[PDB]
Structure formats: C-alpha cells, structure tokens
Amino acid sequence: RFDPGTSNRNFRIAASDFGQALMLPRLYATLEETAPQVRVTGVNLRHGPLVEELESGSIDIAFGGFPTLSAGIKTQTLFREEYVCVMRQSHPALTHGLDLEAFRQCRHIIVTAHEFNHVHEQVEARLLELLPPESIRFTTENFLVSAVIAEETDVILTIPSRLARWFANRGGLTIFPVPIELPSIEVKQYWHERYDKDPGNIWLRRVIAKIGFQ
Amino acid sequence: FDPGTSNRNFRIAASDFGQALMLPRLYATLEETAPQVRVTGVNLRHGPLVEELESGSIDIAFGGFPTLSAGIKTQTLFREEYVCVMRQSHPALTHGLDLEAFRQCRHIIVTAHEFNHVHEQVEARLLELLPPESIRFTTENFLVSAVIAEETDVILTIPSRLARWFANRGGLTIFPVPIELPSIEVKQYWHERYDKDPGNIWLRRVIAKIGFQ
C-alpha cells in the first residue's frame, strides 16, 4: 500500500496556522532523506465538524488541541505548551513593569478559536472574561497574523511560548509572563479509527511522533 | 455614527497576509479618533464573498478578488508584484535562480483556489512549469509559508511586500521569479447595500488614506 521512498502521496494535516508552521519544517529532513516525492499540505481549521473530515479521509491527521475530538478518534500526546505574553520592545509599558490592573488597561489583540473548537478557546474565554471590553482592539483567527501586528503596534498578545520564542528571536517583541494563571495545553496528533491501519497514515504518525519538540 | 464614541466591531475579510498588512495601518486612527472601535480580521472561506458582504457578515473585503462583480463596489488601493525568497543558507543561493535551477529546487506553494483569490493565477503558472516532485509543501496562509521558507530549504513565490517584510527581519533573500507572472491590483470591496452606511463609509475612507509603501 505505501512505500516512502517511492510514494507521491499528498498528506493533509489540519492545524492552526501556528501548528502548521511548527510542524512542517520538522518534517522536511525525513522527506528529503526517505520520502522525496511525498507532499505535506497544511490545512486551516474550519467551522465544520473536524471528525467528519478525518472520517471522510479528507484530512489525514489533525495537530494541536481539539478537546471536542473523541468518538471514533484515536490520539497520541506529543508535548505540553504554556502561554506567555508579548509586547513590542518600543512599548510604553516596557519601560515600566506590569501588574494585573495595568495589564487590563492596555490594548489587546485576541486570537479567537472557539468556532474551530480548538483548545485555545480556553484561553480566549479567560481573556474575554478578564479584560474590559474596551481594552480589546483587534481580533483574528491566525496566531501568526497576531504576532506580526504586535510587532508593528502597541498591543499585548497572549500566545503559546513556542511562537513567542520564534518572534522574540528577532527582537521585535519582549516576552513576559501572563499575570493570571492559564491552563497548560496538551498538544497531540489525532486520527480516525477508519485509518488506524492505513500504512501511509501509520508512517506519518511514526515520523511526527519521533520529532524532537524541545 | 461617531468614531469618537462608537464601539462597533468592524469585520474585514482578507488573507492572513492582507490582515497583517492592514490592521497595523489602522492602529493610530483607532487610538486617536475611534478608541472604542474594534477591527476583526476574517479569513477567506469556502463560500462566495458577495453573500458575506450582503449579509453584513463582512463589512469590507481587502485584497485582490476578480470574482466579485455583481453588487459589489470597489476601490483600487494599490498594485503588487511577485518575487522569490530563499534563506541565505540555501545551496541554490550562490548559484542563480534561472528557470532550470528553479525546477530543481523544492518548493512551497501557497494555494488560493478555494477562496477565489487572485493568487490562483500565480499558483496555476507555477504548477504549469514545475515538475510535480519539486513541490514539497502546500499551505493556504502566506505567513505560514514564509516561516517555513525561513526554516527549510524551500523556494517560496510571494508578493513583494510580504517578501520585503521577512527579508529585513531575517534569513530570506529575495529573487526575481523566472516565470511570467501577472501584476496584481489590490482593492477594497464592499456591497452596495452598505455603500451609504456611515460606519462603512468612515472605514472605507480611513483605508483609502493609508500610504501603502
């Protein structure tokens, strides 16, 4: 059914834009070394029921936190992620510290995710509860968009640390801890039972599961 | 409608590139004159944009959408060209990017077909001229693909503003693309139903006043 060295299969992985940008580069080596005509497509999250897409075969694997996925779904946990805060290094509060109430008074960009039933909705909910409505300036579905915007303007962004670190590395942004206690996230890969024994699917899970996510 | 005291959440539909470009150019106007106004960036979807503009679901669309015509007003904001980027630590760098070398590289392609975005044209041209095995990754977000090109040895063909944005802050280097590609017109789009809506009108005018480099 599936041979890495000769396959032309195009694998589709559903993930947030962040999850995509995290995953695919970690697959490149394996692809050039052992599967040089295999393709990986990063598919955005949708409003429709994700379990259906895994069932129909239109998605091979989902990657991230999808608490709503259960029946007929098999999973494996890959790592934990924690949230932090960022603001750009030419931000007025940077010269200052930031306790909880100064935090509440700044401008925020929120990444929204409840429509996609992605675990980040947990954080989103916490922030919408905490923050004065007037404190929220921008809203977007994409983590990477939100990061770029935080670099170009004075808004505070609350995001997975891995993403924060990737953008900190260019010095646009400073990382500081969230002044509230946010849930720790379990990031996994998800697939459907109907494909548990599919050779290609099995191969992909193996590769993903061997990724050094440290 | 008063900007100074409104709390309206305006929804703009654009590619992730379009959102990243637009919203920052709106911050000052918000800070100075509409401090309670929210802007939301919405991803392009499966369905037809017109039905979203009509619905009120989306206030304005930003980008290049040839398909919007019947009941849509537009104002052209600027025009964009395409280039290639590869990271400085790429073998093909110190060698030139002629068409024959191009074909021998691995590519990441941004796909746009689903949401009738002008990039369809660019995507189609590349697929025409590239062997199916030089294509390694595919994604629908420009920003995703730009960080992937920064992390791995893939070639990425993208709009120059996006390119210039990543070249400055990192390892990607910009190359002309040895493939014939259309120029692009970036417009704002809105339904005629809201042509006269004060809120909309205000937004459209703030945008038409942005100085896109």
Author numbering:
A (entry chain A): 89 to 302
B (entry chain B): 90 to 302
Copied sentences from the primary study:
PcpR and TcpR belong to the LysR transcriptional regulator (LTTR) and are responsible for controlling the degradation of PCP and 2,4,6-TCP, respectively, although their precise mechanism of transcriptional control is not well defined. In general, the LysR family transcription factors consist of an N-terminal DNA-binding domain (DBD) and a C-terminal inducer-binding domain (IBD). The monomeric structure of the PcpR inducer-binding domain contains two nucleotide-binding (or Rossmann fold) motifs connected by a hinge region. The PcpR dimer was established by interactions between β-strands and α-helices from each monomer.
Purified recombinant PcpR protein, which covered the substrate-binding domain (residues from 85 to the C-terminus of PcpR), was crystallized in the R3 space group with 4 molecules per asymmetric unit and solved at 2.7, 2.2 and 1.9 Å resolution for the apo-form, PCP and 2,4,6-TCP binary complexes, respectively. Although 4 molecules were seen in the asymmetric unit, PcpR appears to exist as dimers in solution as illustrated by multi-angle light scattering (MALS) consistent with weak interaction between the two dimers in the crystal lattice. To further analyze the biological relevance of the oligomeric state of PcpR observed in the crystal lattice, the apo-form coordinates were uploaded to the Protein Interfaces, Surfaces, and Assemblies server (PISA). The results of PISA analysis gave average buried surface area of 1985.3 Å2 and ΔG of dimer formation to be −10.1 kcal/mol. Examination of another interface, could establish a potential tetramer, gave an average buried surface area of 254.1 Å2, ΔG of interface formation to be −0.25 kcal/mol, and CSS of 0. Overall PISA results suggested the observed dimer to be biologically relevant, but not for tetramer. Thus, the observed tetrameric nature in the asymmetric unit is likely due to crystal packing forces. A water molecule was located in all apo-form and complex structures of PcpR, forming a hydrogen bond with the backbone amide nitrogen of S104. Despite the close proximity of the PCP-binding sites in PcpR, there were no significant conformational changes of the backbone, or the dimer orientations upon comparing the apo-form to either the PCP or 2,4,6-TCP complex structures. Comparison of PcpR with BenM and DntR indicates that both our apo-form and inducer bound structures of PcpR are in the closed conformation, which could be due to a crystal packing forces.
